[PDB]
């Protein structure tokens, strides 16, 4: 049970060893046959992952329970209630998360390094986030940090999943207490 088979494709990796493509030089006084093609590979330089390194897990646009969230990031998005942003801090302490940087002015705080947990993830993850409210009121959760076994992860695939994981916890606490 290495759990890495859920993050990878099915078939083999043999398609990476395929030799590159080089066109044919035509002799003097003639041409090649032309052309169709109908098979074409426009030039695209990298940069993304290949083979088993590519993460094929379905992307993340939950939760939205008004409910519809805006686009992804680098950002999170959440008709609306009345007032009392501190509900976010009450549900943040309801999960006993560690909180370091605290400001009650702009309705924004910075959440600490408390680690995550997932079943389909190989080693493990963790990260620090930032929560804010910008009024008729929308809660946004961004983050700058990542660690997998202590290694930083800047990739765009995990950023959506682990931003929406914290957004899922916020939506779970506020959804519970608000109803």
């Amino acid at each position: 049970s290495d759990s890495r088979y859920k993050r990878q494709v099915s078939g083999d990796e043999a398609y990476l060893e395929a030799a590159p493509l080089a066109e044919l030089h035509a002799p003097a006084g003639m041409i090649l046959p032309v052309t169709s093609g109908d098979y074409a590979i426009p030039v695209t330089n990298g940069s993304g992952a290949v083979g088993k390194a590519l993460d094929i897990r379905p992307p993340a646009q939950p939760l939205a329970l008004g409910a519809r969230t805006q686009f992804t990031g680098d950002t999170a998005s959440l008709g609306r209630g009345n007032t009392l942003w501190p509900q976010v801090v009450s549900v943040l302490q309801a999960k006993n998360y560690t909180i370091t940087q605290r400001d009650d002015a702009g309705q924004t705080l910075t959440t600490d390094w408390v680690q995550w947990n997932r079943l389909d993830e190989d080693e493990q993850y963790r990260g620090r986030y930032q929560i804010s409210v910008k009024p008729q009121q929308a809660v946004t959760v961004k983050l700058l940090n990542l660690e997998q076994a202590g290694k930083p992860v800047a990739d765009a695939a995990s950023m959506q999943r682990y931003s929406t994981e914290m957004m899922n916890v916020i939506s779970a606490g506020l959804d519970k207490s608000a109803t």
Partner: protein
């Protein structure tokens, strides 16, 4: 050692030209009426030129290969300039 062997079926390869049908071609064709009664040539010309290769090849019953090759050279306007007919082989 193979002096005499068996077995093998007939292998027919090419366009079927009947003799006298080939006698129906003449200089000044439009390349449209060449295809009228001969056939659409199953071998045409790459590279870069215009010639229609009508090849008649047969290989029945271990006997031997019999192929006559009629190649037609057309100009840029679709009119055949040249006719080259070589029956059998060597």
């Amino acid at each position: 050692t193979l002096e005499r062997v068996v077995y093998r079926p007939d292998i027919n390869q090419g366009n079927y030209l009947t003799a006298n049908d080939v006698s129906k071609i003449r200089v000044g064709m439009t390349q449209q009426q060449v295809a009228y009664a001969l056939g659409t040539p199953l071998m045409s010309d790459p590279f870069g030129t215009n010639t229609w290769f009508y090849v008649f090849r047969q290989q029945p019953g271990h006997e031997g290969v019999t192929q006559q090759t009629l190649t037609l050279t057309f100009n840029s306007s679709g009119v055949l300039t040249n006719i080259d007919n070589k029956p059998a082989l060597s």
